Each structure stands twice: as structure tokens, then as C-alpha cells.
Scaffold this active site. Structure first.
Site, mmCIF file in Angstrom:
data_model
loop_
_atom_site.group_PDB
_atom_site.id
_atom_site.type_symbol
_atom_site.label_atom_id
_atom_site.label_comp_id
_atom_site.label_asym_id
_atom_site.label_seq_id
_atom_site.Cartn_x
_atom_site.Cartn_y
_atom_site.Cartn_z
ATOM 1 N N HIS B 126 45.413 3.719 -30.587
ATOM 2 C CA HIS B 126 44.142 3.686 -29.888
ATOM 3 C C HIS B 126 43.993 4.938 -29.030
ATOM 4 O O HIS B 126 44.957 5.370 -28.392
ATOM 5 C CB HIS B 126 44.038 2.427 -29.032
ATOM 6 C CG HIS B 126 43.743 1.194 -29.828
ATOM 7 N ND1 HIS B 126 43.108 0.092 -29.297
ATOM 8 C CD2 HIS B 126 43.981 0.901 -31.129
ATOM 9 C CE1 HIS B 126 42.980 -0.832 -30.232
ATOM 10 N NE2 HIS B 126 43.502 -0.366 -31.352
ATOM 11 N N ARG B 405 44.287 -3.344 -40.765
ATOM 12 C CA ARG B 405 43.120 -3.994 -40.176
ATOM 13 C C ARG B 405 41.854 -3.437 -40.807
ATOM 14 O O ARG B 405 41.691 -2.218 -40.907
ATOM 15 C CB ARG B 405 43.053 -3.795 -38.658
ATOM 16 C CG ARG B 405 41.940 -4.610 -37.995
ATOM 17 C CD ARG B 405 41.840 -4.428 -36.478
ATOM 18 N NE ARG B 405 41.299 -3.119 -36.107
ATOM 19 C CZ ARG B 405 40.773 -2.819 -34.919
ATOM 20 N NH1 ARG B 405 40.696 -3.738 -33.964
ATOM 21 N NH2 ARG B 405 40.315 -1.594 -34.684
ATOM 22 N N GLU B 515 37.227 -11.178 -31.325
ATOM 23 C CA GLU B 515 37.177 -10.361 -30.120
ATOM 24 C C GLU B 515 35.894 -10.544 -29.327
ATOM 25 O O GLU B 515 35.932 -10.514 -28.093
ATOM 26 C CB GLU B 515 37.371 -8.876 -30.469
ATOM 27 C CG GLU B 515 37.624 -7.998 -29.253
ATOM 28 C CD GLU B 515 38.437 -6.771 -29.593
ATOM 29 O OE1 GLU B 515 38.291 -6.255 -30.722
ATOM 30 O OE2 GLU B 515 39.248 -6.345 -28.748
ATOM 31 N N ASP B 552 36.565 -6.161 -26.314
ATOM 32 C CA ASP B 552 35.119 -6.344 -26.334
ATOM 33 C C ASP B 552 34.646 -7.541 -25.516
ATOM 34 O O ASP B 552 33.447 -7.632 -25.223
ATOM 35 C CB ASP B 552 34.636 -6.494 -27.780
ATOM 36 C CG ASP B 552 34.834 -5.231 -28.602
ATOM 37 O OD1 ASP B 552 35.015 -4.148 -28.007
ATOM 38 O OD2 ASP B 552 34.809 -5.327 -29.849
ATOM 39 N N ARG B 590 45.865 -6.752 -26.087
ATOM 40 C CA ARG B 590 45.713 -6.262 -24.720
ATOM 41 C C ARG B 590 45.796 -4.746 -24.646
ATOM 42 O O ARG B 590 46.528 -4.105 -25.404
ATOM 43 C CB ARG B 590 46.779 -6.845 -23.790
ATOM 44 C CG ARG B 590 46.717 -8.342 -23.572
ATOM 45 C CD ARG B 590 47.542 -8.721 -22.349
ATOM 46 N NE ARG B 590 47.508 -10.155 -22.080
ATOM 47 C CZ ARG B 590 48.387 -11.028 -22.561
ATOM 48 N NH1 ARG B 590 49.377 -10.612 -23.342
ATOM 49 N NH2 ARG B 590 48.277 -12.317 -22.261
ATOM 50 N N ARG B 715 32.232 1.584 -27.986
ATOM 51 C CA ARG B 715 33.583 1.045 -27.938
ATOM 52 C C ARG B 715 33.965 0.724 -26.495
ATOM 53 O O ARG B 715 33.510 1.373 -25.549
ATOM 54 C CB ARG B 715 34.578 2.030 -28.553
#
Lengths: 888, 888
Positions: B126, B405, B515, B552, B590, B715
């Protein structure tokens, strides 16, 4: 604190073999303690009585226990020395200080003298390393445990994990077979040697050089030691010395050269990615920018997925990373080429893709350094890049330069085969002059000598093939060709011609080895006669190295006469070299034992005559000594420090030159000492008999340390081993008694002259002091017990004669010096006893011999002796050697 | 002591850019100090007045200086924490003690609960890691310098060399371009991720496990944690998560899998020779002896010269070395196979010559361990062999298991292409029931689905090709397939069928990601409906994992409502899994910032509902957090400790379950907080305008951290970034004011009920405490200055409204908790000011734009903005993020 180790080890011993054996080890320790305290010779027999009761395997376990106790004692010794020295918050900074204050020398004299100073440590595979490598590893781990334990910053769990760790590491060391059941190959010797680099020397060298930089800045010298300043170098004999070791074949030399090259490449390659990561600067001068543009031009826009990091073509943003990127590519291809050349016989890897020059490697790094300093980044450049520069300039493409040693008579045989085959005579039968004239004519001639059709013995073809192996291989992989038993220029010229005729493109320097005492007397004459040859003096290019052996000198003559003659030899050799305007560097073949010229390094260096080093020294590091001087970061640093400081001081603080009265006094003294020594070691016709009975000499070859398969005719190593095992040390002190007695007899003022000499002459002071140390490691009750147990009733008094001399000589030594730890000698004494009685059982006919292994007695099923005995003997030798911190 | 760093760095800054700039940095530091002390908002403008005078390059240098000062502050922070914790001579041994005393739990309950406990840390790429890797290295070296400096055992020369070293290392860090001029590839992300293994995790894991063994022995448990006990595991998304990152292609996944495999093999191979050296025992049981005889049978009596050590065929004397010898051969061939498979497309290396199984590797080591323990060598076996066993059982053949994913709608598109092509309808238009029935019929049917002739979009072929890539590759290289925006069983069944039809031999487990808040409300229903499918419940084999996103949730609704709904979600998910007799493990997505569910790990774990972990936990480690938790031995240990202790305590010390009054109170409170949050973030039509002006949100993508190319549609990472840069933290605290005010309004006893809840409910206590921390990192004067400089005169009061709420909300927080370092906030404030004025200059038309580099201004020659401005902005964002110890 000495009790802590005993507690831990004895607890482990109990956990491995029960209370009973721990209690008998304790009894033996107590008897040995009463002996090393009271010195009642009855206590020895009291201990042997308890020792004779032991089972086959039980005595093995006892010998094991005392041997490992001696080893641990050595390790704790090293730890306590390192901490005691560290808690001070000769020596480098001290040596600089004394050179400034005492001698009024300036910093730039120290710095300039330092730049032009070189010390060439050459590691040998001499079979003096008693502890097998499989155990040396565990020793290293164990001293790591003990070193970490010796601190006040331990957290509880750290200490408990280190207890479990040290316990498991001792238990592992004891669970390994200490007995080399087969002797190594020369390749194995070379591996054992090189293993200290990717363990210690590789990282140790740049740290030491940082320390020299620091010390230089403590004197006010902001400048740093040049990265290419050759302050220290490493050479090797492992796989090269074939003198009396026919198992060192040409293929072995090829193997150790290729091997070493592969090791070096691998180490550089693992360093290079971390260096690339740090060199992330973007400022460079126009030079490095231009070169970086060159490399990014031929960048080969490819995936290059074989690398893990930096697999993408490196951008010109970070030019240091570009240039270092090409350096990594050339390292990769060098490693792959060496690995293929080793693993098969050949490689498809292009040579231009690799580093071929010792400085094709150095060039890009030099460029990075210039750029960094140009751009104000000298702090950065003096970091990992400098460490790397010093590693490259110090280790090169092959970690060590290999010497080739071979005896002259083999070259003589080769030439004789040639002259016989050429129908021209017999080089053997030829006088020296004829040999010289012929060799010269062939060296300056242009016609090839022998052809493919030359008849060759296996020996002849061995030496010719070693020359072809040398020619086939890179020049920077080899050092010097040492000629054993060299006596005339015909030998050096012989090797030179044999090189040229074997098409050795860049022939290596030839160097003679004078080791027998007569050779040391005749050496300066021979060197002058060699320099007289205008051809050789013109091709030698003003530089000459000659080796000076210490092993055989103190074997055939008096140790004293040998040392003195060595001093004269260095002196007159320097005289001759200066007379012919040639830079002499002398190669000292020193051992680890004082009997082979060993002893503390700075003391041996100070005992060299003045103006004989001149910033260029070369010393052997004989087998076992390697472990003693490079097995730890701290040992490595202390070694390099000791050498460089000693040479520097000897350069700027020249030792006093001897007064002529001292010269003549030592000449007479040398005659007396020689007559006394040879009187007891050669005149006595029953001396060889008593030796072969009273010392463990003959059994040495059983330990299988090295790969090399009258008393004048044995190697010096088992010679000193025999007398050091028995703690008698005859070859160390023999001639001194008669020497001093005759000298005080001829004149009483010679006592004041001896007192005068001991206080001012470094050579004499070193000699006498060493003799006193060796006496301090002596106990004649040991040799007495060996005589009582093993010598026939007949010549019992003979040894006592020697024993008489012992005390007599000691009385004189302490008288010229003006003088008047223990506990470890306890353990040693036990092994002494065990070694004695066991020898008596070995030389018995009743105890001779006419699957897996689940107990120690099964470990030797081919023993010509009783099941448990051979192993126990080897164990005693190993252990006693460990306790005395010397093998031979 | 804080002054030492300032002194060293400022001296270096002066040595690099003169007295003048050092003096202006000092002025800025003094103005910021007067601000963080007095808090006069006049001091801010006083500082900006000095800041506006700066040159183009000079302001760059100022931003650089304060940013590196913040970084150094972080590093010294870590050092001081490590030493402060070490000088104590939750926590592991403390947690065991409290579990024994407080809860009366037995040791074997702790041990048994520990054996069956598993914590799966999954590293993500990320784009939250602001500091580029080239600098992270230098940071590591610098904290090494500072760590070694923080001691009382320094020798003078050591300290001076460390001064020169730290000086050169800072000078090197500052001399690197901090600006990523191009964004990484996913492969680069995966390298940055994996680099922590051959740096820290590889050696860190076995040390941590030794520590657990030690702590277990401090409770009386002589036994040790099983080597194959999966107490911790590592997974990865790097190169696998392709959700909204079309640059993560199938070839990328292939690359990261092969890459990781090559890394693992290399590490094992470098370990194996040292292990062989230590396993020098000769005693083994009949088992290991038989096997060693097997290996020595097929020994291949060859030279095997490619190895350096043990190139000779290993003798049966040392059987552990024989078996480990075969292990080294199979490692060599595994490395060579992976390296060829990576570097080319193929390999000639036979598969049988390699380790194919995750335990074909483990078997020989298990055998060695059994033998060692059998022969009384458990201490030895618990050493390097155990470390190695734990490394193998923990890391396997591919250092991490990769998750894939992808969003559900892409699978939907695939299926729709299939059903359209099969002339059977449109899967898109089909109701859920139709999708379920069809998917089921195709999964239980035996006919292939699509053929080679299926029309494919680039997206469609992307996902099908990723399935082919998964099938082509080893099973133990992959983890789970995570479905983004999963809403119905048709999505999980869809992925299952798409796997089976892409001939994925051993299909991986499918897991949904809920999410968005509505998805969290509807999640338990969907999971029960999935388990109702008898087919899936029979193939799922009693184990199910479902991911729970934190990013989110607190973005579209109130942070409070999100946390509470998450709690309900975990609770009801566990309910459903127990209802269907399936072992649920929940995957917590998290972040590092509290706004994405971050915060201290043990606090986040204690805030989980009871009986929801049950010895099986899974948590993301988002980009930047990796550096925070594994960049040092000590950070790595503290991380693994924190996780394992938290899970164990939560297993044996279940947190109290909420009283129903608290349930309903938080439901009402969640309605109020949601209405309050959405009232200001969505109802206000000018809110998006004020956001895009008052925070540095839009500029985030300029830093180029990751490889992924209304306000509801951004985002969560730049969302939290915007409000954390300005130190206002709106999304952290928004709904709490209206929540508490309405709850105390409806009833006054609800104040005593809030006080009651804060003292006993771990979830509430954690929530409120976190809000108070975030307030402690808040200063509304910053957001005030940003409004004054960048917001149009119109909606100035709007922000003040929020500011009002800020204080109001804080007043309530401190009231429910019952409450009433600094200096770093000085530097941050400076950068705040620099960030503000610079933004005003950036959004000006005069400062727009209509070879090598020898100064900083030349570093951005393609800037659409003024020469020096873009770089300065990026610098301010980086620095402020560093000071706050969070990016997004």
C-alpha cells in the site's frame, strides 16, 4: 573465577558419563594440584596408580576431559586478555607517542615511513595445527559465548540462553571425534588456511586500516593512509610448497589458485550490492559523468533478471550506481568464469566480460573516490568505498599470492636429463662454473631447449608440469619460487631458465632458502656471486628477496649459535645488497615454537639487526600460528598491529649495534655452545636410542595433521615437539650452560660484560629473556618420570646429566638477567602422567593385535594396538600441546 | 540530550551550505519554538515572513534540513526507547505471570493454547511508505551509529570512528535525491517488502522463538515450542493485489513468486554449510544410520568441485554431515532451478533433484533432530538445527504466500462473456438465484466451460491469464484469493468455478472483502447464505477466512459508527461460523493511521470481541508500517512479541462482553454520529471545494510512492493523509461531539454510564483513548493558517465551525476519560508554514511554466511549475509525515 569453567564443564561431563567418572577426574585434578603445589615426585606415582586402574574407554574419557579443559582454559585465557586490555579507557598510539617524544621524530616522518612500509604475511600449511577444523569451529562459537558472558549488560534471559548455548556448544564439541582418521589433502590444507578470510581477515583488514587512520589523526595528520599503500599483504604456501611433499602436484597448485580466485570473486560480489545501495549520490565531476554516460550508452537495455536487486537498467540520475553497476556485471562474470573453470576444465565466459587486471577492478572505484572528494564528499568516500578500495588493493583477484617451493636437486635432475638427452654431458657432474656459463648462454640464447620428445621421470615431469601450470595461469595469482637447499647461483639461474623454457609469460621472482647453518655462513658469499652476474643483476630490476630458515638451524647446532649466525647472516646480506645497489627484503621462515625461531612477534622483530628491514618485511605464519593470530577479530587486529608497529619502530628507532667486544664474545660463546650441543646430541652413540625411547617423537605422524607423508634426518617440527611434550625443552637451552661457564671462566669481568649486554643489546636481551620464559614452562620431574617408566635401567644417569645441565643452565640465565597463573599446569601434569604410562603399555607385546560404532572403543577397528590405546595416546599429545599453547 | 543531534546535524549543514543558511534554519527553529511554547498565532506569520524571502534553492535546502531533522528525531526516539526498555534488569513473561496469578491459569494451558495459536502477518504494498528505499538504508546505518553511541563501553577511537561514520552517513543521506522521479513497479514494491527478510525477519524469527522457549521455561515448562508449531506466518500482497492496479499483471505475479522462491533458496543454501560444519556428531540411532547408508550408497563418487567446502564425498563417520550433505545438494539444485526459471523462461534442472515438497526439505532435518534427542543431544538439537527447522517450517520454499485480490465485477464480466458466448444469456442481468444455480451446476458438472475460442477483453484475459499463471506455479507459493466488493455467494462460487476451469490443480481458498459499511452490515447474512450451499460447505472443509476492511468504513460514515459496526460484524460472523460448525479466521485489513484502523497493536487486538480469534488471527501490515515494525532486530522482536502476547491474552483473558444498555446506547450513539458526520461531509455542497483547497490532498499522487496509477470516490489513504498533514484529523473525531452531546441530553445518567463504560469496556476504552491521543497530536492553529492562506474569503467561517466542533469534541473526550516530548512539534510547525505559503505560490498563474544537473534546482527540468517549487512541496509533505510518524 577459574572455578566457573571447571564447574560448568564438570557438570556437563557428569551429565554425559555419570558421577563416578567426574569424581575420578576430580581425584586426578587434586593429585595434580598437590603435585604442582608441593612438587612431591611421590604424588606423580600416586596419580599413575589411580590412572592404571582405568577401563579401556574410561581412560579415553579422562584424556578427553583434560584435553577439553585445557582448550577451554586457552579460550578463557584469550577472553580475559581481551577484556583486560579493553578496560584501559607496545601499541600503535603509544609507539607514535614514543617516536615523537623519545626520538624527536616528526609526524610526517612517521606517516611517510608508514606509507613506504610493507609487511608480507605468508600462511603455511606446516603440520603444526593439532586441533582439527571441525573442532576449531566449535571453539570459535564457545569463545563467542564466553566473550558475551563477560559483561555487565546481560539480561537474565540473554544469560540463560547463553548458558543453554554454551552448554550445547561444549556438548557438541565433546561429541565430535577429535581424531583425524585420515590425513588431509593439500587442498584441505588450503581451505583450512583460506577460511580465515571470509571469517576474519576480509573484514579485519579495513577496520585495522581505519584504526591507523585514526591514530594518524591523533598525531595531527588529517590525511589518510593511501588505499593502495601496501602496508600489509598476504601470501600462501598451501598447495604451493612441494618440498618433500610429493602430494602437492601441479593439479593441486592449479586447484588452490582457481579456488582462491573463486573465493575472492564471491566475496567482492556479495559486497558490491550493498556498496551500490550506499553510493546513491547525484553530484559528480565531469570525469565520472562522462564515464557514466559511456556505461549507460552500452547499457544493454535488458531484463537482467538473474540479479535480485537493480535488475532494471540503472538511470544516469545516480552515476555512482551506474559505474558500480558495470563493476557488478564484471564481478558476476568473473565469478561465473572462475566457478566454471574450477568445476569443469574450461569456461565459455568471455575474458573481456571479466576483470583481467588487478586494477581494471581498481580503476572504476578510484574514479568514484576522485569524484566524491572533488564534490566535497571525502567523509563519504572514506567509508564503505574506502573499505572496498583497501580490500581490492590488498587482496586482489586471488586472495593470496602463492609461492612455489622446491629443492634444488630436483631442478638439477631436470637439467641433467636435458644435457644428457642433448648429448652434451651431465649437468650433475659439471662444476659450478660450467653450470653458470651454460645456463647463461641458454638464457641469453634464442633457441628452444628441450622438445616434446624429452625423456622425463615422474619427478622431472612433475617439476616441468608445475612450470606449465604456472604459465597457464594468471600472473597475479603467484608470488615467489623458493629454492630449498640453494647453494650456488646455478640453482637460481636453473629455475630462471626452466621458467623461460616452459613459456612462463611473466616469470616470477626466484628466491633461495638457506636453512642449514653452513648455508647461512656461506649465504652472503653466494648472494654476492649471484649479483656479480651482470645478466641476472639487470633482469632482477634492483629488487631481491632471499629466505632465511629458522627450523633446521637450531636442530643440528646450538640454538644460541644458530641465532647468532642468523644475526650475522641478515647483517652481511644487507651489506651485500647495498654493495650491489639492490633493495633486499629478507623472508624469515619463523615458526610458532621458540625452537623454530618463534616467540612474540615484536620481540623477534626487535632482535633483527638495524637497517635490515627498510620498510619491507616477510614472515611465515606456520600452520597452528594462523589460528593463534586470526581466529578472532581481536586476535587479527592484535596481530596486524604487532607487526606494523614493530616494523615501524625498528625503522625509526634502530636498535643499538653491538660493540666489538660483544661480537668476539659471542663468537667464542658460539664455538663453546656448538661444541657443547653437538657433544651431547651427536657424539653420544646411544643418544638416538635414548631419544626414541624417552620422548613421544616417533608417534607424531599418528596425528595426521598435514598432507606430507638418524636424528639429523628428521624434520625440525617433530624434533621440537618431542622435547616440548615432555616439558624439558633441551633444544631451546642446551649450549647456554657451557657457553656462560666458559665465558666467565676465561675472564671474571665477562660477568659484568654479560650484565652489560643484557641491559642494552636488544638481540641478547630477547634471547636470554626467551630462554627464561621457556624455563618457566619447564619441569624436569616430567622427563624424570618418562625416563623411569620408559628408559631401560642402563642409561638412566644419562638423562640426569642433561637434567643437571638444565638446572645449571637456568642458574646462569637468571644470573645474566638478574632475576630470582599456575593451576593449568595441574591438568597438563595429569596428561603427562597419562602419556607416560600409556607409552609403556603401547611398547608391550601383550597389548598388540594379532560396521557402525556405538561407543568410543569402536572408533579404531584397524588399530594394530590394543582397542583403547592408540586413541588415548593421540589424545594425550593433543591435550599437552594445547596446554603448552605450542605444538612444534 | 535532544541538543546533541541538533548540534551534529547543524554542524554538518554548515559544512555543506555555510553559516548564513544554518542561521536562518536556527531563526526558523526559534520562531517555531516560540510558537509551540507561547502559541501566539502571530508567531506563525512572523515565521512565514522570514520564509517568503527565501531563494528558489534555499527554501529547498530549508525543507530538506527540517525533514532530515524529523527523521533523525524518529531514529533517536527509537534508540532511547530501546535502551530505556533494556535497562530493566504488556510483555511476554509479564503476560504469562498475569495469566497465572490473576486468572489462575495453569502453565500447560498457556503452553497448549500457545501451540494452537497462529498469527498471519501479511505485508502489503500500500502506497503509504513515504521514505524511498535508497534513504531507508542510510537511516538503518545511522540508527546503527546512534545505537552504538548510546553506551558507556566506548573506547575513544571507537567513538571518533563512529563520529566520522555518523557524519559521513548523514552527509550521504542528505546528498541523495529524496524525490522519487518515477513511480516503482510492483516488482520493486515486492523487493522493498522482501528485503526485510535477508535483513531482519530471517534471523529474527528463530531468536524470538528461543525467547518464547525461555519464557516457557521460566514458568516451569522444560518442553519447547514445536518447530512446526505455526505460531507466526508471513503472507504478501506485493505483486498479487491487482484491485484497481492494472500494472499488477499475471507476469508480475509470476515474477514475484519466482523471485521470492529464489530468495528463500539462496538464504537456506548460505545457512546450510555452517550447519553441516556444526553437525559433526558420530552417534545416531539405527534410523539415521540406515538413511545415511542410503545416501552414501548413491553418493556419486565425483569431484563435485562447484562447492568450496565439503567437495569430497562425505564419509559415513559423521552421518549428520552425510544427510545434511544431500540436503545441500537438493538446495543447490533448487536455487539453480529457480534462478534459471527466473532469468530465462525455463530450466533444464530435473525436478527430482530439487525440493518439491514443503517437507521433503523438513524430513531430513526432522530425522537429524530425532537422532540427536535419541542420543541425548537435545541441547545440541535445540541450537542451529532448531533455528533451521523453525526457519524452514516458518518460511517454506517461498518466503511468503501470495494473496491475489481482485474486484467481484471483473469476475462478473468474465462470466458474462462466457454465458453470452455460450448463447445462454447474460450473467450480469441474471438474478442472484440464477447465478447460484448455474454456478453450482457448472462446478458439479464434468464438461469444460469455455474453450480456446472464447472472445476476451484485455481485462477478461487479464483475470483468466492470472488464473493460468496460478495453475502453472507451485501450490505452496500462494495464499488466498481475496474478492473485493463481495456481496453475494455468486462471487465466491464464481471465483471457484473460474479456478477449476483454468485447471488450477490445487485451488486456493476464496475469501471475501467487506469494506464499505453497508457490506459490513450485510456480511453475516451473506456468509450464512454461503454456508447454506451444501457443496461449498463440503469443499470448504470446516475452515473459512473472511477479510474485514478498515480503510473505507470510516470514510463514508462516522469513524465511531464504523468501529462499532465492525465490532458487531466480528461478533455475528463468529456466531454464523459456529452455527455452521466452521472454523472462522477473520482477516483485519488495518492500516497504520488510526483513521484506517491503525494504532497500537495490542490495543487493537484487545478491542476485538471475545471468542472471535480462537488462536487464529490475520492482520495487514500496510506499506509504511513494515518499516516501523521490522527495520531493526529490536523492532522485529517487539512486533512479534506484541502480536503473540495480545492474541494469547485475548484467548485466555476474554474481554468483558457489553451490557445491553451499552449496546443500545452505542446504537443510538452510532445513528447520531453518522448523521453528524455525513451532515458535514456530504450534505454540504461546498464541502468538496473547501477540501480541495484547504488540504494538500490533490498533490498526494506527486510523491510516486506506489505503483497504482467526488469525495466518496477517492482512496482512503489520501483522505486520511490530507487531514493528518494539517494536524486537524477530522475523520478521526468527527461524530463524537454530537454523539456524546445527544446522549447526555436524552438522559443525564448517561454521563455516569459513559464513565462506567470507559472504565470496564475494552472496546470503548480503546476507542476513547485513541481519540484522545489523536487530539494530543492536534493543533487547530495549523488548519486556521491553511484556511487563511488558501481558502477564499467566502467560506472562512465553515472551517471555524469544524474548529468549534474540534474543541467541543475534545472537551467531551477528556470528560469521558476523566483527564485534564514537545520540541519536535517545533520542526513540524515550520514545515507546516512552509507547506502553506508554498501551496499559495503553486496555485498561482505567474509561477507556471509556459543535460546533467549540478544543483538542486536542475533536478526537476520537466516541472510544469516554477523551477524550485514542486520539489519543495513534496519535501514538505514527506517531512510532516515523518514528524507525525504516519503517512496515511
Amino acid at each position: 573465577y577459574d572455578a566457573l569453567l571447571l564447574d560448568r564443564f564438570l557438570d556437563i561431563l557428569q551429565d554425559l558419563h555419570g558421577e563416578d567418572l567426574r569424581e575420578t577426574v576430580q581425584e586426578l585434578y587434586e593429585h595434580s594440584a598437590e603435585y604442582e603445589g608441593k612438587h612431591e615426585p611421590k604424588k606423580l606415582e600416586e596419580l599413575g596408580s589411580v590412572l592404571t586402574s582405568l577401563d579401556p574407554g574410561d581412560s579415553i574419557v579422562i584424556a578427553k576431559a583434560f584435553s577439553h579443559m585445557l582448550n577451554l582454559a586457552n579460550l578463557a585465557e584469550e577472553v580475559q586478555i581481551a577484556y583486560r586490555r579493553r578496560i584501559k579507557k607496545s601499541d600503535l598510539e603509544e609507539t607514535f607517542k614514543k617516536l615523537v617524544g623519545d626520538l624527536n621524530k616528526s609526524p610526517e616522518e612517521i606517516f611517510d615511513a608508514l606509507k613506504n612500509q610493507t609487511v608480507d604475511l605468508v600462511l603455511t600449511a606446516h603440520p603444526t595445527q593439532s586441533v582439527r577444523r571441525s573442532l576449531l569451529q566449535k571453539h570459535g562459537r564457545i569463545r563467542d559465548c564466553l566473550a558475551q558472558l563477560y559483561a555487565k549488560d546481560i539480561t537474565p534471559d540473554d544469560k540463560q540462553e547463553l548458558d543453554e548455548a554454551l552448554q550445547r556448544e561444549i556438548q557438541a564439541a565433546f561429541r565430535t571425534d577429535e581424531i583425524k582418521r585420515t590425513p588431509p589433502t593439500p587442498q584441505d590444507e588450503m581451505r583450512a588456511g583460506m577460511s580465515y578470510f571470509h571469517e576474519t581477515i576480509w573484514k579485519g583488514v579495513p577496520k585495522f586500516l581505519r584504526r591507523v587512520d585514526t591514530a594518524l589523526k591523533n598525531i595531527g595528520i588529517e590525511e589518510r593512509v593511501p588505499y593502495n599503500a601496501p602496508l600489509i599483504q598476504f601470501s600462501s604456501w598451501m598447495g604451493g610448497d612441494r618440498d618433500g611433499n610429493p602430494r602437492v602436484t601441479p593439479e593441486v597448485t592449479r586447484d588452490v589458485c582457481l579456488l582462491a580466485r573463486m573465493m575472492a570473486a564471491t566475496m567482492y560480489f556479495n559486497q558490491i550490492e550493498d556498496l551500490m545501495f550506499e553510493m546513491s549520490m547525484w553530484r559528480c565531476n565531469d570525469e565520472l559523468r562522462a564515464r557514466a554516460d559511456e556505461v549507460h550508452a552500452n547499457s544493454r537495455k535488458d531484463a537482467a533478471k538473474h540479479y535480485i536487486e537493480f535488475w532494471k537498467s540503472i538511470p544516469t540520475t545516480e552515476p555512482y550506481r551506474v559505474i558500480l553497476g558495470d563493476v557488478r556485471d564484471k564481478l558476476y562474470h568473473t565469478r561465473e568464469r572462475a566457478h566454471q573453470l574450477l568445476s569443469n576444465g574450461h569456461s565459455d565466459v568471455p575474458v573481456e566480460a571479466t576483470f583481467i587486471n588487478l586494477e581494471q577492478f581498481l580503476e572504476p572505484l578510484e574514479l568514484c573516490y576522485r569524484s566524491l572528494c572533488s564534490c566535497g564528499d571525502r567523509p563519504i568516500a572514506d567509508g564503505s568505498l574506502l573499505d572496498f578500495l583497501r580490500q581490492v588493493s590488498t587482496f586482489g583477484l586471488s586472495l593470496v599470492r602463492l609461492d612455489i617451493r622446491q629443492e634444488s636437486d630436483r631442478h638439477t635432475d631436470v637439467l641433467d636429463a636435458i644435457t644428457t638427452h642433448l648429448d652434451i654431458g651431465s649437468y650433475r657432474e659439471w662444476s659450478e662454473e660450467r653450470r653458470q656459463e651454460w645456463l647463461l648462454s641458454e638464457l641469453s640464447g634464442k633457441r628452444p631447449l628441450f622438445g616434446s620428445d624429452l625423456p622425463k621421470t615422474e619427478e622431472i615431469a612433475d617439476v616441468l608440469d608445475t612450470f606449465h601450470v604456472i604459465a597457464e595461469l594468471p600472473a597475479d595469482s603467484f608470488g615467489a619460487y623458493i629454492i630449498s637447499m640453494a647453494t650456488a647461483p646455478s640453482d637460481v639461474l636453473a629455475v630462471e631458465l626452466l621458467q623461460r623454457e616452459c613459456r612462463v609469460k611473466q616469470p616470477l621472482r626466484v628466491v633461495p632458502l638457506f636453512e642449514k647453518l653452513a648455508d647461512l655462513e656461506a649465504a652472503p658469499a653466494a648472494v654476492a656471486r649471484l649479483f656479480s652476474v651482470d645478466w641476472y643483476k639487470n633482469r632482477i630490476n634492483g629488487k631481491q628477496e632471499v629466505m632465511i630458515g629458522y627450523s633446521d638451524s637450531g636442530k643440528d647446532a646450538g640454538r644460541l649459535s644458530a641465532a647468532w649466525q642468523l644475526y650475522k647472516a641478515q647483517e652481511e646480506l644487507v651489506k651485500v645488497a647495498k654493495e650491489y645497489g639492490v633493495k633486499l627484503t629478507m623472508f624469515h621462515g619463523r615458526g610458532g615454537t621458540v625452537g623454530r625461531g618463534g616467540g612474540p612477534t615484536h620481540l623477534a622483530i626487535l632482535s633483527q639487526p638495524p637497517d635490515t628491514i627498510n620498510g619491507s618485511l616477510r614472515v611465515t605464519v606456520q600452520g597452528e600460528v594462523i589460528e593463534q593470530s586470526f581466529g578472532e577479530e581481536h586476535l587479527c587486529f592484535r596481530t596486524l598491529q604487532r607487526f606494523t608497529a614493530a616494523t615501524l619502530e625498528h625503522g625509526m628507532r634502530p636498535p643499538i649495534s653491538p660493540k666489538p667486544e660483544w661480537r668476539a664474545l659471542l663468537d667464542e660463546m658460539a664455538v663453546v655452545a656448538t661444541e657443547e650441543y653437538r657433544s651431547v646430541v651427536f657424539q653420544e652413540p646411544r643418544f638416538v636410542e635414548y631419544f626414541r625411547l624417552a620422548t613421544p617423537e616417533l608417534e607424531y605422524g599418528r596425528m595426521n595433521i598435514g598432507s606430507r607423508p638418524g636424528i639429523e634426518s628428521l624434520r625440525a617440527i617433530p624434533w621440537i615437539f618431542a622435547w616440548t611434550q615432555t616439558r624439558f625443552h633441551l633444544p631451546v637451552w642446551l649450549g647456554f650452560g657451557s657457553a656462560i661457564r666458559h665465558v666467565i671462566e676465561k675472564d671474571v669481568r665477562n660477568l659484568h660484560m654479560l650484565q652489560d649486554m643484557y641491559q642494552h643489546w636488544p638481540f641478547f636481551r630477547v634471547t636470554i629473556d626467551l630462554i627464561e620464559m621457556v624455563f618457566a614452562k619447564g619441569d624436569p620431574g616430567i622427563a624424570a618420570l618418562y625416563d623411569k617408566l620408559l628408559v631401560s635401567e642402563e642409561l638412566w644417569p644419562f638423562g640426569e646429566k642433561l637434567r643437571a645441565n638444565f638446572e645449571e643452565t637456568k642458574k646462569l640465565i637468571l644470573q645474566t638477567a638478574g632475576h630470582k597463573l599456575r593451576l593449568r599446569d595441574s591438568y597438563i601434569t595429569t596428561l603427562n602422567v597419562c602419556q607416560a604410562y600409556t607409552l609403556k603399555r603401547i611398547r608391550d607385546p601383550s597389548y598388540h593385535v594379532t560396521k557402525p560404532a556405538k561407543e568410543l572403543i569402536e572408533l579404531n577397528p584397524t588399530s594394530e594396538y590394543a582397542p583403547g590405546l592408540e586413541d588415548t595416546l593421540i589424545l594425550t599429545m593433543k591435550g599437552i600441546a594445547a596446554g603448552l599453547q605450542n605444538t612444534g
